[PDB]
Amino acid sequence: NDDDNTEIIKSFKNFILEFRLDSQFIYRDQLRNNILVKNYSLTVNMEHLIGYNEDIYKKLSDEPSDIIPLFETAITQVAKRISILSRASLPTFQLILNSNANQIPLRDLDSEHVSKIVRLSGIIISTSVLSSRATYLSIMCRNCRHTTSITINNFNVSLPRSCLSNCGPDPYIIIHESSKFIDQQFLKLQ
Amino acid sequence: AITARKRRPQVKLTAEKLLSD
Amino acid sequence: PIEILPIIFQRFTTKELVTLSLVCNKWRDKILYHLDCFQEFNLAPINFKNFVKFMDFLQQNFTRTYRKYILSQVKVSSRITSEELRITQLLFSKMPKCINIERLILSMPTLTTTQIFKLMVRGGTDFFTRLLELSLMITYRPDKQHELEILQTCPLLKKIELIFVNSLVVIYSELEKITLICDKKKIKNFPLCRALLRGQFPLLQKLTITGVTFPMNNQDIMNFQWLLNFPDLKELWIEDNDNCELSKFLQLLKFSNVWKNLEKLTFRENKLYPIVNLDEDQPVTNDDEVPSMLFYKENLQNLEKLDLMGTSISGSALTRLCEQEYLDGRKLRSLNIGNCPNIQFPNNHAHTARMILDVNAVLKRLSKLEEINLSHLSSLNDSTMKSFIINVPFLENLKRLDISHNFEITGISIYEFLKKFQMDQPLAYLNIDGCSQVSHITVNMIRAQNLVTQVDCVYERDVWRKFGINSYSYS
Amino acid sequence: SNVVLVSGEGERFTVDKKIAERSLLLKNYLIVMPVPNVRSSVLQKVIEWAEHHRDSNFPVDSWDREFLKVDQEMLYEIILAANYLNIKPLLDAGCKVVAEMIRGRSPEEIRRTFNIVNDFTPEEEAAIRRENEWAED
Amino acid sequence: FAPDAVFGDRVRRFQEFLDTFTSYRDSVRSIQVYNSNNAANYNILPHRIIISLDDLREFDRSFWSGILVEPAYFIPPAEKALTDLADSMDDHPWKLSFKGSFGAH
Ligand SMILES: [Zn+2]
């Protein structure tokens, strides 16, 4: 499985590093320009992703909840390669998508669209406070203090049920000092 | 050497007890 | 080569060789014919019928006119409580006369002393007069003193153990080691009390009494007056003897040269008796008369191992033992003072002065020691460990350090202690089981940078008294 | 000065006297010594063993068990050797390797290992097993 | 990297800081003598010091940024060093407080 994930990641790394229009490497430039002002994200136009290699867009649109994290991982690797000297740290970059696909009006979205990429429009009626979600949990066993960590991607997660080698019935707790968190906000669209 | 392992004691009517005073 | 075969066989153990009898009729005879290939039996546990077939196997094979063969270890224990009696009956009824059990471990917990004695008496397979070592995990009886009569019955006995798992209601030159262990919950008296105070055991090298309850009615018992009976006593271990006191013991040690030589002492009272300070008062009947010669030096001058875990000794008492040079130092190698609530280290602002331990003086005195145990010594907070850090130059012999089950000691003190010790080459071994405050990453650093050859961090281990290894208090 | 042996097949060998006096009867039987019982190949193995264990002290062995991880039949001929003319450390090595060989093996495993038949009448083998079971683990 | 291995150096650096900016030693002793007087005279000041965070910067920028960015590893040694200072004064854990120039924090 992770061999295929490695190949997906390499394909996205090549998309960032190779995609070019009219002599400009727009995604290398955008990634660098974002890094300088210290926003760790990349805005990708899916027209360009389709134009580069439509197999990649097929993988992404088939199952975005597994493929978006791999694309974000690819962006981190290129970010380091174009902003940190190789052999003389950054968070996991957010992937932002621009699209011109046909919109689905809010009332038409239903069971056939579950897990698909969807484009729509509306009016935001509410905005909640910034809740905190984990990107990376430092973890240890309450009894034997076996220590491990869980990387988390927010596309649909839990702690393990029992210790990874007696430790009791439900043994793991979080270590908040070495865990990492991100802002999460809820919006209501009408 | 052997630290303890448990067992269940039991009591019943018996001829000696039945022959006690 | 039929003559050399025992040398081959004895590299493999009894039951396993007996299975090897079935390989072929030839090798069956080659094994079976050499009785001295058997020197241990383990029937632990065994069911009645298999014990019958064991006795039968002796009655067929070992039965011989020549009064030769002897067995170096016979462990027997019943699978079933009722069959305990049947196995023991058969053993003393049918053991072949010409064959001498050297060392009998008759682990028969249900059986009483009286019944064991009767089975020897009316069983009449007389080897039990002539065996060398004995052990009896058995039920005690307070009503009768038959266990004393075991020694009288068994004149060749050098090493005797009794493990009085339950209760139900003159010169002994032969003996060398007496181990008396009791279930403190079930046993509510002292089995060998009359025997120990009245008799002498003049060649007794080691004595180990645990779990017994000293009578209140007998100050001769409580003052260890009997304990004077046993010169040459190379080691004394005494633990969880609920109504004893280290105070009375030290009063004995004050007023007689009771022992020409103790190589090791181990005293562990269970409940917190009041503070004992070293009773250095040397009274004079008159200044016109001699001050009483205090025998602390010549009594304790010989010690290699001193163990006082839980004993309420005050810190100053131990410093005085070192400043007086009653403890020799040049011969002392292992010191255990764990669980002593009356120890405080010099950096502590909160104290009464005579509870202070002056570790600098102590480690100057007895520098060549190998093994320290400070487990359960809650007073050893991180600040107090600084005293050990600065006294690293005086403990260069130290290999084994137990400080486990200390709920205070952070990994900071552990780390800087091992780091200054590294200025001495790792410490050989360190125990911090149950120490809730040592950070897992720190002990993983200790492993990774190899500051200790072995370090134990079983955080989940609730207790320290490993039976046989650390303690002879029963279960 | 090194002593000159004669094997049990006839050819000569030469080793240092302490190497030769790994044989304990060499001190008595008789700078020349006939060794009538020991085969040529076996005496070579005896010599090379003693040449490794030149300085070994005697009042499980890692080197011996692999040094002797060899033909069973020649190895048991070493067991038959080293005893009519006594060479005790080789007996110790032999005990160690045969015990390590034997340790886990049933009667049928031993029958195929030492290459022998079931010499019992089998119902009597069953009977003795049925009279033996306290050896059961 | 494990915190315990650097705890001692962090302790002695905060001890050197407190020794340097002796107004904090004077504050510790003032609190102690006030509390002793009011205990005997028969209302109590707390075992707490406000350190000017600027002083800690000017002393040691690395430790200062440690307090700001990794307080879970830098406040416990600072409070241990402060407690040891209070212990070094004649005759309970002491706590810290901060003032000044937090910047982005
Ligand atoms: Zn665990």
mmCIF file with all atom_site columns, C-alpha atoms in Angstrom, chain C residues 82-207:
data_model
loop_
_atom_site.group_PDB
_atom_site.id
_atom_site.type_symbol
_atom_site.label_atom_id
_atom_site.label_alt_id
_atom_site.label_comp_id
_atom_site.label_asym_id
_atom_site.label_entity_id
_atom_site.label_seq_id
_atom_site.pdbx_PDB_ins_code
_atom_site.Cartn_x
_atom_site.Cartn_y
_atom_site.Cartn_z
_atom_site.occupancy
_atom_site.B_iso_or_equiv
_atom_site.pdbx_formal_charge
_atom_site.auth_seq_id
_atom_site.auth_comp_id
_atom_site.auth_asym_id
_atom_site.auth_atom_id
_atom_site.pdbx_PDB_model_num
ATOM 1   C CA . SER C 1 82  ? -6.390 -35.546 50.213 1.00 0.00 ? 82  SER C CA 1
ATOM 2   C CA . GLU C 1 83  ? -3.804 -37.467 48.169 1.00 0.00 ? 83  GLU C CA 1
ATOM 3   C CA . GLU C 1 84  ? -1.098 -35.532 50.046 1.00 0.00 ? 84  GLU C CA 1
ATOM 4   C CA . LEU C 1 85  ? -1.673 -37.943 52.920 1.00 0.00 ? 85  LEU C CA 1
ATOM 5   C CA . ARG C 1 86  ? -1.694 -40.997 50.636 1.00 0.00 ? 86  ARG C CA 1
ATOM 6   C CA . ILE C 1 87  ? 1.577  -40.023 48.920 1.00 0.00 ? 87  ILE C CA 1
ATOM 7   C CA . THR C 1 88  ? 3.328  -39.351 52.233 1.00 0.00 ? 88  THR C CA 1
ATOM 8   C CA . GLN C 1 89  ? 2.014  -42.603 53.752 1.00 0.00 ? 89  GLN C CA 1
ATOM 9   C CA . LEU C 1 90  ? 3.280  -44.611 50.795 1.00 0.00 ? 90  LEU C CA 1
ATOM 10  C CA . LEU C 1 91  ? 6.650  -42.801 50.848 1.00 0.00 ? 91  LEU C CA 1
ATOM 11  C CA . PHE C 1 92  ? 7.479  -43.598 54.459 1.00 0.00 ? 92  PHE C CA 1
ATOM 12  C CA . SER C 1 93  ? 5.833  -47.048 54.225 1.00 0.00 ? 93  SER C CA 1
ATOM 13  C CA . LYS C 1 94  ? 7.551  -48.452 51.104 1.00 0.00 ? 94  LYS C CA 1
ATOM 14  C CA . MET C 1 95  ? 10.850 -46.606 50.462 1.00 0.00 ? 95  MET C CA 1
ATOM 15  C CA . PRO C 1 96  ? 13.555 -49.288 49.826 1.00 0.00 ? 96  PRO C CA 1
ATOM 16  C CA . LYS C 1 97  ? 15.668 -49.795 52.951 1.00 0.00 ? 97  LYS C CA 1
ATOM 17  C CA . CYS C 1 98  ? 19.062 -50.000 51.207 1.00 0.00 ? 98  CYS C CA 1
ATOM 18  C CA . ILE C 1 99  ? 18.610 -46.612 49.461 1.00 0.00 ? 99  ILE C CA 1
ATOM 19  C CA . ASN C 1 100 ? 19.268 -43.338 51.342 1.00 0.00 ? 100 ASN C CA 1
ATOM 20  C CA . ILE C 1 101 ? 17.543 -40.084 50.429 1.00 0.00 ? 101 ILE C CA 1
ATOM 21  C CA . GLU C 1 102 ? 20.185 -37.405 50.924 1.00 0.00 ? 102 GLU C CA 1
ATOM 22  C CA . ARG C 1 103 ? 17.941 -34.325 50.663 1.00 0.00 ? 103 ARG C CA 1
ATOM 23  C CA . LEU C 1 104 ? 14.149 -34.512 51.042 1.00 0.00 ? 104 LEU C CA 1
ATOM 24  C CA . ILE C 1 105 ? 11.932 -31.578 50.037 1.00 0.00 ? 105 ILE C CA 1
ATOM 25  C CA . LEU C 1 106 ? 8.559  -32.855 51.211 1.00 0.00 ? 106 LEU C CA 1
ATOM 26  C CA . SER C 1 107 ? 6.326  -29.982 50.138 1.00 0.00 ? 107 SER C CA 1
ATOM 27  C CA . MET C 1 108 ? 3.069  -31.180 51.736 1.00 0.00 ? 108 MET C CA 1
ATOM 28  C CA . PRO C 1 109 ? 1.183  -28.084 52.958 1.00 0.00 ? 109 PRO C CA 1
ATOM 29  C CA . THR C 1 110 ? -1.962 -29.786 54.289 1.00 0.00 ? 110 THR C CA 1
ATOM 30  C CA . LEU C 1 111 ? 0.001  -32.241 56.444 1.00 0.00 ? 111 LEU C CA 1
ATOM 31  C CA . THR C 1 112 ? 0.692  -31.380 60.076 1.00 0.00 ? 112 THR C CA 1
ATOM 32  C CA . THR C 1 113 ? 3.919  -31.764 62.046 1.00 0.00 ? 113 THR C CA 1
ATOM 33  C CA . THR C 1 114 ? 2.327  -34.488 64.196 1.00 0.00 ? 114 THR C CA 1
ATOM 34  C CA . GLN C 1 115 ? 1.246  -36.524 61.179 1.00 0.00 ? 115 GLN C CA 1
ATOM 35  C CA . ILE C 1 116 ? 4.671  -36.162 59.495 1.00 0.00 ? 116 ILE C CA 1
ATOM 36  C CA . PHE C 1 117 ? 6.350  -37.331 62.701 1.00 0.00 ? 117 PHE C CA 1
ATOM 37  C CA . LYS C 1 118 ? 3.993  -40.314 63.005 1.00 0.00 ? 118 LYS C CA 1
ATOM 38  C CA . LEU C 1 119 ? 4.609  -41.303 59.387 1.00 0.00 ? 119 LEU C CA 1
ATOM 39  C CA . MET C 1 120 ? 8.342  -41.439 60.025 1.00 0.00 ? 120 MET C CA 1
ATOM 40  C CA . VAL C 1 121 ? 7.880  -43.287 63.354 1.00 0.00 ? 121 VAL C CA 1
ATOM 41  C CA . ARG C 1 122 ? 5.450  -46.030 62.245 1.00 0.00 ? 122 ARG C CA 1
ATOM 42  C CA . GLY C 1 123 ? 6.530  -45.988 58.585 1.00 0.00 ? 123 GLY C CA 1
ATOM 43  C CA . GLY C 1 124 ? 9.931  -47.243 59.694 1.00 0.00 ? 124 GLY C CA 1
ATOM 44  C CA . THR C 1 125 ? 11.821 -46.827 56.397 1.00 0.00 ? 125 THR C CA 1
ATOM 45  C CA . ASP C 1 126 ? 14.612 -45.530 58.586 1.00 0.00 ? 126 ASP C CA 1
ATOM 46  C CA . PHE C 1 127 ? 16.544 -43.324 56.076 1.00 0.00 ? 127 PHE C CA 1
ATOM 47  C CA . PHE C 1 128 ? 14.924 -40.276 57.738 1.00 0.00 ? 128 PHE C CA 1
ATOM 48  C CA . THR C 1 129 ? 17.375 -40.778 60.612 1.00 0.00 ? 129 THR C CA 1
ATOM 49  C CA . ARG C 1 130 ? 20.195 -40.632 58.094 1.00 0.00 ? 130 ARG C CA 1
ATOM 50  C CA . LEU C 1 131 ? 19.280 -37.984 55.498 1.00 0.00 ? 131 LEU C CA 1
ATOM 51  C CA . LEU C 1 132 ? 21.349 -34.797 55.301 1.00 0.00 ? 132 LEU C CA 1
ATOM 52  C CA . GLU C 1 133 ? 18.936 -31.937 54.458 1.00 0.00 ? 133 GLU C CA 1
ATOM 53  C CA . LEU C 1 134 ? 15.189 -31.528 54.976 1.00 0.00 ? 134 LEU C CA 1
ATOM 54  C CA . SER C 1 135 ? 12.413 -29.116 54.042 1.00 0.00 ? 135 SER C CA 1
ATOM 55  C CA . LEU C 1 136 ? 8.781  -29.066 55.180 1.00 0.00 ? 136 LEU C CA 1
ATOM 56  C CA . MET C 1 137 ? 6.194  -26.764 53.645 1.00 0.00 ? 137 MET C CA 1
ATOM 57  C CA . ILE C 1 138 ? 3.587  -27.992 56.152 1.00 0.00 ? 138 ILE C CA 1
ATOM 58  C CA . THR C 1 139 ? 0.808  -27.061 58.549 1.00 0.00 ? 139 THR C CA 1
ATOM 59  C CA . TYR C 1 140 ? 2.012  -26.037 62.011 1.00 0.00 ? 140 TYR C CA 1
ATOM 60  C CA . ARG C 1 141 ? 0.406  -27.229 65.240 1.00 0.00 ? 141 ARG C CA 1
ATOM 61  C CA . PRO C 1 142 ? 0.650  -24.977 68.361 1.00 0.00 ? 142 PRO C CA 1
ATOM 62  C CA . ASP C 1 143 ? -0.697 -27.730 70.624 1.00 0.00 ? 143 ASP C CA 1
ATOM 63  C CA . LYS C 1 144 ? 2.435  -29.974 70.350 1.00 0.00 ? 144 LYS C CA 1
ATOM 64  C CA . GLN C 1 145 ? 6.184  -29.542 69.798 1.00 0.00 ? 145 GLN C CA 1
ATOM 65  C CA . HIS C 1 146 ? 6.726  -32.472 67.390 1.00 0.00 ? 146 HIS C CA 1
ATOM 66  C CA . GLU C 1 147 ? 8.914  -30.365 65.057 1.00 0.00 ? 147 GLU C CA 1
ATOM 67  C CA . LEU C 1 148 ? 11.629 -30.372 67.740 1.00 0.00 ? 148 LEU C CA 1
ATOM 68  C CA . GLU C 1 149 ? 11.327 -34.141 67.775 1.00 0.00 ? 149 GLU C CA 1
ATOM 69  C CA . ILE C 1 150 ? 12.051 -34.119 64.022 1.00 0.00 ? 150 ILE C CA 1
ATOM 70  C CA . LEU C 1 151 ? 15.558 -32.840 64.774 1.00 0.00 ? 151 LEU C CA 1
ATOM 71  C CA . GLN C 1 152 ? 15.883 -35.411 67.540 1.00 0.00 ? 152 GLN C CA 1
ATOM 72  C CA . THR C 1 153 ? 14.719 -38.063 65.028 1.00 0.00 ? 153 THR C CA 1
ATOM 73  C CA . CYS C 1 154 ? 17.053 -36.864 62.251 1.00 0.00 ? 154 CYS C CA 1
ATOM 74  C CA . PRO C 1 155 ? 20.553 -36.682 63.809 1.00 0.00 ? 155 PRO C CA 1
ATOM 75  C CA . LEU C 1 156 ? 22.452 -36.372 60.497 1.00 0.00 ? 156 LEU C CA 1
ATOM 76  C CA . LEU C 1 157 ? 20.532 -33.203 59.529 1.00 0.00 ? 157 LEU C CA 1
ATOM 77  C CA . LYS C 1 158 ? 22.731 -30.209 58.641 1.00 0.00 ? 158 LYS C CA 1
ATOM 78  C CA . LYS C 1 159 ? 20.268 -27.910 56.795 1.00 0.00 ? 159 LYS C CA 1
ATOM 79  C CA . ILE C 1 160 ? 16.594 -27.764 57.823 1.00 0.00 ? 160 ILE C CA 1
ATOM 80  C CA . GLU C 1 161 ? 13.862 -25.540 56.406 1.00 0.00 ? 161 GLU C CA 1
ATOM 81  C CA . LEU C 1 162 ? 10.303 -25.217 57.662 1.00 0.00 ? 162 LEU C CA 1
ATOM 82  C CA . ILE C 1 163 ? 7.652  -23.173 55.881 1.00 0.00 ? 163 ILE C CA 1
ATOM 83  C CA . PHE C 1 164 ? 4.659  -23.186 58.204 1.00 0.00 ? 164 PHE C CA 1
ATOM 84  C CA . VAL C 1 165 ? 2.043  -22.314 55.614 1.00 0.00 ? 165 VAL C CA 1
ATOM 85  C CA . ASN C 1 166 ? -0.907 -22.750 58.019 1.00 0.00 ? 166 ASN C CA 1
ATOM 86  C CA . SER C 1 167 ? -1.897 -23.555 61.634 1.00 0.00 ? 167 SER C CA 1
ATOM 87  C CA . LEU C 1 168 ? -4.335 -26.173 62.982 1.00 0.00 ? 168 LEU C CA 1
ATOM 88  C CA . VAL C 1 169 ? -5.458 -27.119 66.510 1.00 0.00 ? 169 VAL C CA 1
ATOM 89  C CA . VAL C 1 170 ? 20.647 -30.115 74.973 1.00 0.00 ? 170 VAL C CA 1
ATOM 90  C CA . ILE C 1 171 ? 23.121 -30.031 72.079 1.00 0.00 ? 171 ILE C CA 1
ATOM 91  C CA . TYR C 1 172 ? 22.417 -30.120 68.324 1.00 0.00 ? 172 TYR C CA 1
ATOM 92  C CA . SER C 1 173 ? 26.013 -30.076 67.007 1.00 0.00 ? 173 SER C CA 1
ATOM 93  C CA . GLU C 1 174 ? 24.937 -31.585 63.674 1.00 0.00 ? 174 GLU C CA 1
ATOM 94  C CA . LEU C 1 175 ? 23.078 -28.500 62.473 1.00 0.00 ? 175 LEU C CA 1
ATOM 95  C CA . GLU C 1 176 ? 24.449 -25.849 60.098 1.00 0.00 ? 176 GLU C CA 1
ATOM 96  C CA . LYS C 1 177 ? 21.518 -23.805 58.677 1.00 0.00 ? 177 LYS C CA 1
ATOM 97  C CA . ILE C 1 178 ? 18.026 -23.222 60.141 1.00 0.00 ? 178 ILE C CA 1
ATOM 98  C CA . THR C 1 179 ? 15.423 -21.467 57.960 1.00 0.00 ? 179 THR C CA 1
ATOM 99  C CA . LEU C 1 180 ? 12.063 -20.817 59.661 1.00 0.00 ? 180 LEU C CA 1
ATOM 100 C CA . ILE C 1 181 ? 9.413  -19.118 57.508 1.00 0.00 ? 181 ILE C CA 1
ATOM 101 C CA . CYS C 1 182 ? 5.777  -18.533 58.504 1.00 0.00 ? 182 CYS C CA 1
ATOM 102 C CA . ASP C 1 183 ? 2.521  -17.154 57.146 1.00 0.00 ? 183 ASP C CA 1
ATOM 103 C CA . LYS C 1 184 ? 2.277  -14.160 59.479 1.00 0.00 ? 184 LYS C CA 1
ATOM 104 C CA . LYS C 1 185 ? -1.519 -14.111 59.049 1.00 0.00 ? 185 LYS C CA 1
ATOM 105 C CA . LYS C 1 186 ? -2.032 -17.771 60.032 1.00 0.00 ? 186 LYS C CA 1
ATOM 106 C CA . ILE C 1 187 ? 0.863  -18.281 62.474 1.00 0.00 ? 187 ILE C CA 1
ATOM 107 C CA . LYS C 1 188 ? 0.224  -16.468 65.779 1.00 0.00 ? 188 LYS C CA 1
ATOM 108 C CA . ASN C 1 189 ? 3.103  -17.746 67.963 1.00 0.00 ? 189 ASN C CA 1
ATOM 109 C CA . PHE C 1 190 ? 6.785  -18.746 67.628 1.00 0.00 ? 190 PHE C CA 1
ATOM 110 C CA . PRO C 1 191 ? 7.350  -22.482 66.764 1.00 0.00 ? 191 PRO C CA 1
ATOM 111 C CA . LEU C 1 192 ? 10.941 -23.148 67.900 1.00 0.00 ? 192 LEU C CA 1
ATOM 112 C CA . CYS C 1 193 ? 10.823 -20.738 70.896 1.00 0.00 ? 193 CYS C CA 1
ATOM 113 C CA . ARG C 1 194 ? 11.534 -23.333 73.601 1.00 0.00 ? 194 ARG C CA 1
ATOM 114 C CA . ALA C 1 195 ? 14.071 -25.137 71.410 1.00 0.00 ? 195 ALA C CA 1
ATOM 115 C CA . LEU C 1 196 ? 15.996 -21.989 70.504 1.00 0.00 ? 196 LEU C CA 1
ATOM 116 C CA . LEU C 1 197 ? 16.191 -20.564 74.028 1.00 0.00 ? 197 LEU C CA 1
ATOM 117 C CA . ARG C 1 198 ? 16.919 -23.867 75.808 1.00 0.00 ? 198 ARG C CA 1
ATOM 118 C CA . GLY C 1 199 ? 19.169 -25.697 73.356 1.00 0.00 ? 199 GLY C CA 1
ATOM 119 C CA . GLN C 1 200 ? 22.461 -24.839 71.713 1.00 0.00 ? 200 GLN C CA 1
ATOM 120 C CA . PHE C 1 201 ? 23.255 -25.240 68.019 1.00 0.00 ? 201 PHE C CA 1
ATOM 121 C CA . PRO C 1 202 ? 26.986 -24.612 68.274 1.00 0.00 ? 202 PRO C CA 1
ATOM 122 C CA . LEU C 1 203 ? 27.953 -25.127 64.589 1.00 0.00 ? 203 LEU C CA 1
ATOM 123 C CA . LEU C 1 204 ? 24.978 -23.118 63.262 1.00 0.00 ? 204 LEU C CA 1
ATOM 124 C CA . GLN C 1 205 ? 26.328 -21.007 60.385 1.00 0.00 ? 205 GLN C CA 1
ATOM 125 C CA . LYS C 1 206 ? 23.147 -19.330 59.087 1.00 0.00 ? 206 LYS C CA 1
ATOM 126 C CA . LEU C 1 207 ? 19.830 -18.573 60.783 1.00 0.00 ? 207 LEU C CA 1
#
